[PDB]
Amino acid sequence: KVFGRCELAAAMKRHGLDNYRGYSLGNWVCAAKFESNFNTQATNRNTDGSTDYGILQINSRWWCNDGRTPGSRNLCNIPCSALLSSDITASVNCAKKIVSDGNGMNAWVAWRNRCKGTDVQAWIRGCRL
């Protein structure tokens, strides 16, 4: 599924991401835009052989099991394919564990390089939330 911007904002809010660990909703929408272009089916392979999955590009070396990342931890205890669903629940629940692990949203390279320090509230401007 490819979300609209406000559609995704509303889904993320309903799933408790607004201000989760202090990160306003715009941060999450911005990260999703640049990680996946709002596409739940996005996948990208990394140089170390791990793969990133879904709207928030969650990595198989630490967070989910895709059966082909040797020595990987499955800290969200989910198959990586569950992160590609049109229902973003599994991605949101895993993202909450990631953002609580010490480094905050810096875990998402695109957030660090393209959202951090910008006016992220623009990502939810105009939305009926």
Strands (E), the chain: 43-45, 51-53, 58-59
Q: Are 55 and 40 in contact (CB under 8 A)?
A: yes
Binding residue (CB under 5 A) for Cl ion from 37, 106, 113, 118: 113
Closer residue to Cl ion in complex, CB, 32/78: 32
70 vs 40: CA distance, rounded Å? 24
Binding residue (CB under 5 A) for Cl ion from 6, 10, 11, 110: 110
What is the x/- site pattern for Na ion, positions 34-53, by CB under 5 A? Answer: ---------x-------x--
Q: Can you give the binding site for Cl ion, defined by CB under 5 A? A: 109-110, 113
